Structure 1
Amino acid sequence: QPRRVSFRGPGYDPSRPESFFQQSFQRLSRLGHGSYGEVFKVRSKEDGRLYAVKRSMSPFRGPKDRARKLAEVGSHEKVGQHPCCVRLEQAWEEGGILYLQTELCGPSLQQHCEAWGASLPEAQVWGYLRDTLLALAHLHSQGLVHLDVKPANIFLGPRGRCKLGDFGLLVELVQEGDPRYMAPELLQGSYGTAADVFSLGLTILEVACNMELPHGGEGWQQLRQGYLPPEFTAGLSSELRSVLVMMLEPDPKLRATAEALLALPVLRQ
């Protein structure tokens, strides 16, 4: 039977063998898949509304495997309702499989940039920067660190808005993060809310310049200093180059916070 998963303290007939997910949802399309599992766009058979549902691939190996997957629901609940964060509707487990039902969002910022095959227009980038900064400011005011800010985890909303999602790595002040967007202080085992600001800086640098970020090597080292590659950052404006330099400050003690960036004249919007 389905077990509701939470940390805040009709249609389904258990008589027949199909799982609750097959029984209560219309599989419209698969939005993504991987080692984690699958994500589907669904239409709920109870209200007709559209949602996105992510399910794990294989049953729980053990208690640690279960608590690891279930922690995403807890991390998602600690964030709470915010306009710039993907809203979790409900989560449950059945047959050792964990299901997460959220609101339906547009394509990810990674998909959006790949579809255009070029640098996003700078007015479009400022909106994505501000919206994700607002999301990080919401997380960081609660002592939460996302630790996986990247274009694949930023999802478009209507009229040029975007929302921050995938809170599976979120920690309250750790697993392996993406090295392309990793803040330098994480190498020494030092984490804080400043790590998300750096990852957002590399995220904006990727989408505004259409450059692939290095997984390692010297190019990875150069981005963790104060050095922007003049080959790719040539097209940026003065205001945008100024903001990225502050977000990419190597010293987390000196790196600007999300609240500080949002108070700047260009981002005060």
Structure 2
Amino acid sequence: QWALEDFEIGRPLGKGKFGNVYLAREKQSKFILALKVLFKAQLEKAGVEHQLRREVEIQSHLRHPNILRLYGYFHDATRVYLILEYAPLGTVYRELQKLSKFDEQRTATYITELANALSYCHSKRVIHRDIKPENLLLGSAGELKIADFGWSVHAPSSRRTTLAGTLDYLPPEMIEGRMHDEKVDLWSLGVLCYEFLVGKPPFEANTYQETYKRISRVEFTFPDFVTEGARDLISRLLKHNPSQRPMLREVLEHPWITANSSKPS
């Protein structure tokens, strides 16, 4: 259907391991959107054609205000182009760089939006498994949107693909290649809540090995400024045993969440 010729490409929005994302406008409609560009030889080499397929299938069919829309795709013998909803306010990653730490209202609002999106995903047994600030985008009203569903699967699942980057957002079962399910995204929510309030993730370390050790032993401590309500939610989410992690409904109705969030469940 679409081809490269139908679009005027604009400024670079960002770069991932595989994605090179650009602002773009469709010529006929003048519709502004984001083009995620992937190099076929890079996908083949790393063997992640299944991730690309997964991303297209899942994001084209999911419909939720806190999940980024994928509209379609096309290709040209060197690259694949995913046609995405454009997120004008950038990433939570950037915003964290800007502000260093988030206040409790901003944190609880993001956690609420995340939890609403994940609740919708999990109802279909879709687990994301790659929740981290670079994959959380902001819409025109500043609302969080989950993107980058390439690592997503239907639960329960094993891990077949190599872990390339940081382990910071991943639970013990996921790193160790054990079977896992929905509860992986709950652990990640805990990591995010801590990072939002503190400015860095709780198991952060100087090496991959040190990071892995901290995660498998669940070794984290709180700075003095983290309030008791936050400590409670975060402690509940960051449990080694997945079955002990709370339900998303329990996150949404947590007293620290309901007192600080500007958005409802």
Q: TM-score range by the shorter chain?
A: 0.7 to 0.9
- What is the 5 A alignment of 1:234-245? 234-245=224-235
Equivalent pair of 2:171/2:215 in contact (CA under 8 Å) = no
Q: Conserved in 1, the CA contact under 8 Å of 2:66 and 2:117?
A: yes
Paired with 2:44 and 2:208, the residues of 1 have a C-alpha distance of: 32
Structure 2 counterpart of 1:39, which letter? V
| Residues matched between the structures, number | 246
In the alignment, the residues of structure 2 paired with residue 68 and residue 225 of structure 1 have an alpha-carbon distance, to the nearest angstrom, of 30
Q: Following the alignment from structure 2 to structure 1, what is the Cα–Cα distance between the partners of residues 119 and 28?
A: 35
Report the Cα offset of residue 228 of structure 1.
Answer: 3.2
Aligned residue runs from structure 1 range 1-269, under 5 A: 20-21=3-4, 23-59=5-41, 61=44, 66-78=49-61, 80-105=62-87, 106-116=89-99, 118-173=100-155, 174=159, 175-177=161-163, 178-186=166-174, 187-212=176-201, 213-214=204-205, 216-218=208-210, 220-225=212-217, 227-230=219-222, 233-268=223-258, 269=264
TM-score by length of 1: 0.82
Q: Is the 8 A contact 1:226 1:245 kept in 2?
A: no
How big is the alpha-carbon RMSD for the aligned residues of Structure 1 and Structure 2?
2.3
Write out per-residue CA displacement over residues 123-170 of structure 1, whole angstroms, 9 at most, x where no aligned residue: 111111111111111111111110101111111123332111100000
Deviation, 1:92, is 2.1
User: Distance between the aligned counterparts of 2:162 and 2:116, measured in 1?
Assistant: 25
- Hey, what's the Cα distance between the residues in 2 that align with 1:68 and 1:264? 34
1:15 aligns with: none
Structure 1's consecutive aligned runs of 4 or more residues displaced over 6 angstroms after TM superposition are none
Deviations along 1:232-261, one digit per CA (max 9) or x if unpaired, are x32112221111111111110111122221
| 1:63-102 Cα deviation digits (max 9, x unpaired) | x654443232113235x11011001111222224221111
Amino acid at match of 2:34: A
What is the aligned-residue identity percentage?
22
CA displacement, residues 28-76 of structure 1 (integer Å, 9 cap, x when unaligned): 20112244141001122121121111011244649x6544432321132
8 A Cα contact 1:35 1:57, kept in partner: no
Cα deviation, 1:2-46, whole Å, max 9, x if unaligned, reads xx6xxxxxxx7xxxxxxx22x111212011224414100112212
Segments of 5+ residues of structure 1 without an aligned counterpart are 5-11, 13-19
SS of 2:162's partner is coil
TM-score (normalised: structure 2): 0.83
CA contact (8 A) 2:23 2:32 kept: yes
Answer with 1 or 2: which has the greater Rg: 1
**TM-fit CA distance, 1:219:** 5.6
Q: Distance in 2 between matches of 1:61 and 1:185?
A: 27
The Cα offsets for residues 198-251 of structure 1, whole Å up to 9 and x where unpaired, read as: 112112212210125235445653455555313xx3211222111111111111
The one-letter amino acid paired with 2:229 is E
Q: 1:17 maps to which residue?
A: none
